[PDB]
Amino acid sequence: MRKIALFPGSFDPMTNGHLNLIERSAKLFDEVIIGVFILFTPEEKKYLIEEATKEMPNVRVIMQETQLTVESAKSLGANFLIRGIRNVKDYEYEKDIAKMNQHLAPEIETVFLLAEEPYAHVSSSLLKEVLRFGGDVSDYLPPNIYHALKQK
Amino acid sequence: MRKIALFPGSFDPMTNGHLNLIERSAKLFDEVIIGVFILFTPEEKKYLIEEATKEMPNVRVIMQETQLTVESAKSLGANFLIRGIRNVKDYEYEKDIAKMNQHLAPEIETVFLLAEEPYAHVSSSLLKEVLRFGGDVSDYLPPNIYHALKQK
Amino acid sequence: MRKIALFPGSFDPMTNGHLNLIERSAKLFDEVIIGVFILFTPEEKKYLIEEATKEMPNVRVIMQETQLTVESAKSLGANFLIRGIRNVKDYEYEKDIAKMNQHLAPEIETVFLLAEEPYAHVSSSLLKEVLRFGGDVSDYLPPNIYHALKQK
Amino acid sequence: MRKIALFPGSFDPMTNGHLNLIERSAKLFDEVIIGVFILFTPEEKKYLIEEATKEMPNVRVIMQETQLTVESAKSLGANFLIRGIRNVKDYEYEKDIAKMNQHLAPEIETVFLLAEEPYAHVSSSLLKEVLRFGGDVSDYLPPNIYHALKQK
Amino acid sequence: MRKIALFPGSFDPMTNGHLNLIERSAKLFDEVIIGVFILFTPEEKKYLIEEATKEMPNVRVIMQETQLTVESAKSLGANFLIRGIRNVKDYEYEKDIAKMNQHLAPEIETVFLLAEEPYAHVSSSLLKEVLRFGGDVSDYLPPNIYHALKQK
Amino acid sequence: MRKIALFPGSFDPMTNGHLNLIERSAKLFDEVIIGVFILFTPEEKKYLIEEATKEMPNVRVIMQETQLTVESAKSLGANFLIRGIRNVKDYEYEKDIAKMNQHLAPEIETVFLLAEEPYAHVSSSLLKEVLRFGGDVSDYLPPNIYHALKQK
Ligand SMILES: CC(C)(CO)[C@@H](O)C(=O)NCCC(=O)NCCS
Ligand SMILES: CC(C)(CO)[C@@H](O)C(=O)NCCC(=O)NCCS
Ligand SMILES: CC(C)(CO)[C@@H](O)C(=O)NCCC(=O)NCCS
Ligand SMILES: CC(C)(CO)[C@@H](O)C(=O)NCCC(=O)NCCS
Ligand SMILES: CC(C)(CO)[C@@H](O)C(=O)NCCC(=O)NCCS
Numbered sequence: 021m022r023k024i025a026l027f028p029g030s031f032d033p034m035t036n037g038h039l040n041l042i043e044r045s046a047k048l049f050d051e052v053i054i055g056v057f058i059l060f061t062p063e064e065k066k067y068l069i070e071e072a073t074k075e076m077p078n079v080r081v082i083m084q085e086t087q088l089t090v091e092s093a094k095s096l097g098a099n100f101l102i103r104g105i106r107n108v109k110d111y112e113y114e115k116d117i118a119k120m121n122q123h124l125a126p127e128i129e130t131v132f133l134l135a136e137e138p139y140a141h142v143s144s145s146l147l148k149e150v151l152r153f154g155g156d157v158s159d160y161l162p163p164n165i166y167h168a169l170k171q172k
Numbered sequence: 173m174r175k176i177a178l179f180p181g182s183f184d185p186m187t188n189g190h191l192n193l194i195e196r197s198a199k200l201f202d203e204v205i206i207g208v209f210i211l212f213t214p215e216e217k218k219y220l221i222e223e224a225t226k227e228m229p230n231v232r233v234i235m236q237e238t239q240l241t242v243e244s245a246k247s248l249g250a251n252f253l254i255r256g257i258r259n260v261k262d263y264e265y266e267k268d269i270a271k272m273n274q275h276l277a278p279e280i281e282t283v284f285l286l287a288e289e290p291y292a293h294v295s296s297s298l299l300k301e302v303l304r305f306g307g308d309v310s311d312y313l314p315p316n317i318y319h320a321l322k323q324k
Numbered sequence: 325m326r327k328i329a330l331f332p333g334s335f336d337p338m339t340n341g342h343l344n345l346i347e348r349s350a351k352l353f354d355e356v357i358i359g360v361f362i363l364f365t366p367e368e369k370k371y372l373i374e375e376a377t378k379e380m381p382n383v384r385v386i387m388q389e390t391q392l393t394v395e396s397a398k399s400l401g402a403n404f405l406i407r408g409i410r411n412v413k414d415y416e417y418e419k420d421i422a423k424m425n426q427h428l429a430p431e432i433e434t435v436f437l438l439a440e441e442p443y444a445h446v447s448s449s450l451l452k453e454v455l456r457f458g459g460d461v462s463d464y465l466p467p468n469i470y471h472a473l474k475q476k
Numbered sequence: 477m478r479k480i481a482l483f484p485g486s487f488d489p490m491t492n493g494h495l496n497l498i499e500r501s502a503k504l505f506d507e508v509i510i511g512v513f514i515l516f517t518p519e520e521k522k523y524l525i526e527e528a529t530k531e532m533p534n535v536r537v538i539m540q541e542t543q544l545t546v547e548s549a550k551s552l553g554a555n556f557l558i559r560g561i562r563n564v565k566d567y568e569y570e571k572d573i574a575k576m577n578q579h580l581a582p583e584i585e586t587v588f589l590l591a592e593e594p595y596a597h598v599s600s601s602l603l604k605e606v607l608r609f610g611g612d613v614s615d616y617l618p619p620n621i622y623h624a625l626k627q628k
Numbered sequence: 629m630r631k632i633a634l635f636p637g638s639f640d641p642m643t644n645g646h647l648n649l650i651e652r653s654a655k656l657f658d659e660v661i662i663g664v665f666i667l668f669t670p671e672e673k674k675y676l677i678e679e680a681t682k683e684m685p686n687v688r689v690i691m692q693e694t695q696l697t698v699e700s701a702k703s704l705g706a707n708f709l710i711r712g713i714r715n716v717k718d719y720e721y722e723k724d725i726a727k728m729n730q731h732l733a734p735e736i737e738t739v740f741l742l743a744e745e746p747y748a749h750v751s752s753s754l755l756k757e758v759l760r761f762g763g764d765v766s767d768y769l770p771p772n773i774y775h776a777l778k779q780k
Numbered sequence: 781m782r783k784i785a786l787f788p789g790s791f792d793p794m795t796n797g798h799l800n801l802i803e804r805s806a807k808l809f810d811e812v813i814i815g816v817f818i819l820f821t822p823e824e825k826k827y828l829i830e831e832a833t834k835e836m837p838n839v840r841v842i843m844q845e846t847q848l849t850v851e852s853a854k855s856l857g858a859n860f861l862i863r864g865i866r867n868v869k870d871y872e873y874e875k876d877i878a879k880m881n882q883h884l885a886p887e888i889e890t891v892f893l894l895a896e897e898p899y900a901h902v903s904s905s906l907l908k909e910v911l912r913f914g915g916d917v918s919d920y921l922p923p924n925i926y927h928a929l930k931q932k
């Protein structure tokens with residue numbers, strides 16, 4: 021049977037780091053479900069995310085009204101969560117989340133990949149602040165998300 | 173003379189991990205004062221914690237108006253602060269605090285215990301995320317505190 | 325495609341922590357190969373591990389002349405390497421090895437699992453040091469590897 | 477490159493640990509510009525900092541309205557950013573900012589000085605919490621900043 | 629439990645950091661045993677540490693052939709292991725040990741103290757390197773260990 | 781103080797990480813000394829490194845017999861030591877080294893630069909093992925050093 025993974029996240033905004041991880045998990049799982057956990061509408065956001073990922077046949081996007089990620093995985097038939105780790109802070113944060121999740125849904129595995137070195141310093145919080153100051157972060161964004169962004 | 177330790181905290185809520193550290197430090201010190209720094213009434217928390225720590229004869233609960241923890245310890249004749257460490261982010265946060273405490277009250281020693289591995293991942297803000305979303309976190313709460321909790 | 329994973333190690337000795345990781349990874353992958361990179365003769369090492377891992381159909385064991393882990397993975401048709409992370413130290417060490425592996429073989433992906441918490445303090449140098457002083461670590465080794473080690 | 481450094485920060489308030497980093501980095505660069513990004517009016521903040529740094533003739537203060545730090549460094553002609561690291565959390569944090577700044581302005585180098593161990597536990601939020609409760613942290617502040625502190 | 633604490637170590641040499649830890653835990657325990665696990669002879673070693681520790685009435689020195697710490701605890705009748713933590717590397721190291729000891733002897737508690745800031749950088753191995761090149765590390769050693777040391 | 785830095789190391793072999801640091805520090809100091817502490821004759825190693833660095837007019841190579849890094853600096857008139865940081869581990873190790881050197885020679889300032897992200901996973905123990913086993917690590921070596929490694 022299939023191995024399906026939920027990639028949860030808020031994707032505000034989606035990054036090349038995000039896509040990179042999406043790309044690589046697409047190679048490892050039969051399928052990958054990107055759960056966007058809800059300025060930019062939930063008709064909008066899914067759009068851009070679907071556009072950015074169209075190249076991979078076994079990926080799809082989903083607006084999850086906010087709720088236990090393991091609930092939402094259980095519903096879609098996901099036995100795997102997939103997450104990236106970029107630095108120690110990130111490791112300890114995800115490790116906590118993964119331990120809670122194993123408590124709530126022990127039959128779900130969290131699986132990790134390391135961020136690719138070009139994207140390891142990138143976090144939405146740092147990104148937004150730079151956007152807000154109008155630095156050029158175009159190299160870190162899927163271009164559709166980029167084109168989309170500059171009506172701000 | 174008695175060696176008295178103050179265990180500061182807001183116990184919002186108190187976890188089995190807290191209890192474990194209290195149980196462990198009641199073996200270490202002559203007595204342990206649970207300083208609840210201020211959901212429910214200042215009366216009610218006291219009650220609950222007292223209930224949960226009832227089995228430990230040398231442990232008592234004192235609601236504290238917000239002040240310097242070291243001033244609060246000075247007041248009670250506690251020459252020791254007892255803290256847990258659960259992970260590296262925890263270590264660095266507590267270490268800062270102890271050093272500033274050592275600067276403020278050089279006579280008071282902060283002592284540390286490490287979290288028991290079943291609880292190392294449990295923080296109060298994560299516990300609260302799970303509760304918000306309806307997750308079963310009962311194995312992490314003192315039975316009285318869980319019962320007293322369903323009621324809101 | 326098809327998803328084949330190399331789990332490299334020295335397994336000196338093989339713990340329940342190793343096993344946990346094998347079992348978890350036996351559910352992610354079409355198949356998982358255990359690379360014993362070379363006390364006891366390789367026959368026994370191979371035998372013990374096979375014996376201890378005899379419940380999982382899609383797991384096999386392979387002795388490896390030590391050599392680059394990425395080459396030995398090419399030979400097996402493994403596109404994946406599977407690793408545990410048990411703490412920060414483990415994290416920084418596997419990260420380095422994973423990037424180098426990626427530079428040596430950008431088509432093998434390294435995949436991570438966090439250690440399950442009864443085993444996250446276990447490492448074979450700690451084990452071996454405890455074993456050398458007569459300490460009881462029977463709970464930490466698979467029964468057969470244990471039974472076998474008492475015989476030597 | 478000409479040796480011109482921007483030392484950015486909020487200095488709310490300026491500590492001795494700040495003053496220490498300025499003194500050392502004024503031995504390294506031709507000129508050091510203290511970048512104060514906006515309690516007390518920026519007007520008072522300026523006076524106060526130039527009061528504390530008065531003995532170092534190659535140091536000077538500027539009030540910057542928040543804008544990208546690199547952009548402030550360009551308008552000033554500085555090719556060096558100077559930062560302090562006090563612990564691991566701070567390392568990973570400054571590292572992200574430096575990688576991002578290298579992106580926005582790769583001609584600008586970020587340079588690091590390790591916190592002098594008497595001020596390593598000292599951060600702003602901490603100091604202020606202590607001040608909020610009347611703790612004596614006078615040792616951590618340059619006398620001129622203490623004297624100006626008392627009025628509320 | 630009786631407030632009897634084992635402070636195990638190789639003490640070669642014993643530094644002012646060790647002594648600082650001993651002094652601080654002599655404020656806490658009724659008995660602090662320095663379990664000295666065996667350059668100079670046992671005798672000389674015993675004599676020097678006894679001499680360094682002479683001002684604390686509840687401290688005694690005991691030589692011990694290398695063995696599991698928790699067996700040496702059992703035999704001496706200590707209920708506590710005391711250890712210091714100087715940085716993150718020390719934190720993860722001590723943590724694994726403490727976890728394994730709890731498994732060996734769950735009735736023995738490990739208690740932790742943070743290193744005092746001025747000795748946080750001193751490890752016995754960095755210190756041997758520096759002595760081995762003739763640097764002046766006399767401030768880091770108890771006056772008497774230092775004399776005894778020139779001589780030999 | 782005069783902008784004379786020492787860059788101490790064993791350079792076995794020398795990497796592009798090394799070269800990057802040198803290039804960057806060459807922009808910041810008036811003179812950078814490569815301090816080579818002693819497969820190759822020192823004389824060979826000297827010409828190799830000189831050849832790698834030939835393009836920076838303020839850089840120079842000096843062989844030193846093993847000794848306290850700060851004595852070597854003082855001998856050569858360097859007021860600054862320049863080091864790199866690649867990860868948390870390196871950060872904690874450098875930091876102990878810097879504090880000790882500061883105790884030993886408080887007039888000498890240690891200055892840090894963060895490793896560039898292509899080279900941040902590269903350590904000399906890691907390359908050696910890879911060279912041992914025959915892997916193409918040529919994008920991590922300056923060519924002249926690499927060509928020379930075809931020896932035996
Ligand atoms: C958005 C995400 C994935 C980032 O860490 C995480 O915050 C998440 O799961 N949000 C939805 C709520 C949930 O399930 N919490 C359970 C915590 S054990
Ligand atoms: C911050 C907290 C909740 C847990 O670490 C606890 O330390 C706390 O609020 N204490 C009361 C305020 C105080 O004494 N702050 C100065 C500490 S140096
Ligand atoms: C699996 C490992 C790395 C221990 O973590 C170790 O078992 C290993 O690889 N041995 C073969 C040598 C190798 O391939 N080195 C290059 C790694 S970049
Ligand atoms: C004040 C300071 C230095 C503390 O970290 C930092 O917050 C800072 O840079 N503020 C200016 C805004 C900026 O340039 N942000 C993007 C950095 S990638
Ligand atoms: C070597 C020493 C004294 C610190 O310099 C201490 O760390 C130590 O534990 N020594 C060996 C005894 C032992 O029981 N090891 C297994 C621990 S689970």
Ligand SMILES: CC(C)(CO)[C@@H](O)C(=O)NCCC(=O)NCCS
Binds near residue numbers: 757788847849880
């Ligand atoms: C080459 C180098 C710098 C890499 O860490 C390291 O090997 C080094 O320090 N060598 C010289 C010996 C020294 O000075 N030791 C004590 C410093 S407190």
